[PDB]
Symmetry: D3
Subunit: 67 residues, 6 copies
């Protein structure tokens, strides 16, 4: 129940932990892949691990269109 | 060939024009819907129309993770 | 349970509805005020109205520091 | 005098330096905590340190609403 | 003294007002042009108009690279 | 042909690699400089290095105005 209109369910297929940030790669419907860069603290708090089923969220104003 | 690593192909299923901004809704693999808000100038220049085959692009640092 | 680390509870003190976007102003702790621009559809779906108690959410990478 | 309408004064209560990025945590009115991830270069240039009195700035189009 | 590392001085050559947002177009050094979409209220508050000399500011995390 | 209206051609004058992110600094027309923080993987994938000619891309909704 958040304003961000793009909510994409997926499964974790990759995780890389940096000093401040962390990279999460999710496989969503149709084989598409979504890549997320978040704080390292969050990775630790949401129990992010390979195989976990999670949801990618994006604000509409952050989505560009390519023709 | 742009750094934004998230590229999701889709078809236009919704279009609403504002004074400065415009809203484009794309249907992607699995019926998921991606909503984008961009400049009105761009819709016009990219010739966005119902049925067009376009692509949604998102920077990794804009993707959040939900548990 | 989302990665975005900034979650600020507040009360709606202002709402302006545009064609594509909408502006929401919330009063949070200490009298601070937060201003949000979201899609008009969201305003309609989350039942946004003056007096409503809601939460402002922000990704860490979108926060700048001013000295 | 910048368009970002959200300006929240606070004191530094956390600082973690990465190779490229850095994390700053500010305590604002009510003990709320704001977390910011910026360039390592900037922390150094703005002389960010525990106890400093700084200000968090956020563009309105980056603030989401949660119900 | 804001952490955002991109500060581009320029002159207003275009200004379009919408209901909630506004579009500002600046001509910057060297023949380049920058386009910004911000809140209508900020435009009104900073007294933006054709001919004004202002600065465009962008967070490093929001700049993409294209090859 | 991406909707992002800001496309600034430039040359790489600085490149710093971190664990998850990377910092690219470009010199653009007219003596201006642009700094970008993107994923380390994209840098590696687009083969970014000192001297390369590339383009910085920014969404209009991410450009702030300072008076
Ligand atoms: O209504 Mo949003 O937060 O622009 O997706
Ligand atoms: O070590 Mo970083 O600056 O979190 O990629
Ligand atoms: O390499 Mo990006 O531009 O953070 O997706
Ligand atoms: O960068 Mo975060 O961990 O989505 O607030
Ligand atoms: O009428 Mo708007 O301000 O382009 O949604
Ligand atoms: O007027 Mo803003 O820069 O969308 O907060
Ligand atoms: O990521 Mo910055 O240091 O706000 O440009
Ligand atoms: O808001 Mo835009 O049309 O992606 O620059
Ligand atoms: Ca943004
Ligand atoms: Ca952003």
């Amino acid at each position: 129940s958040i304003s961000a209109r793009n909510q994409l369910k997926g499964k974790v297929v990759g995780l890389k932990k940096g000093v401040v940030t962390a990279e999460v790669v999710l496989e969503i419907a149709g084989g598409n892949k979504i890549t997320s860069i978040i704080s390292l603290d969050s990775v630790e708090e949401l129990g992010v691990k390979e195989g976990a089923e999670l949801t990618a969220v994006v604000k509409s104003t952050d989505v560009m269109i390519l023709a």
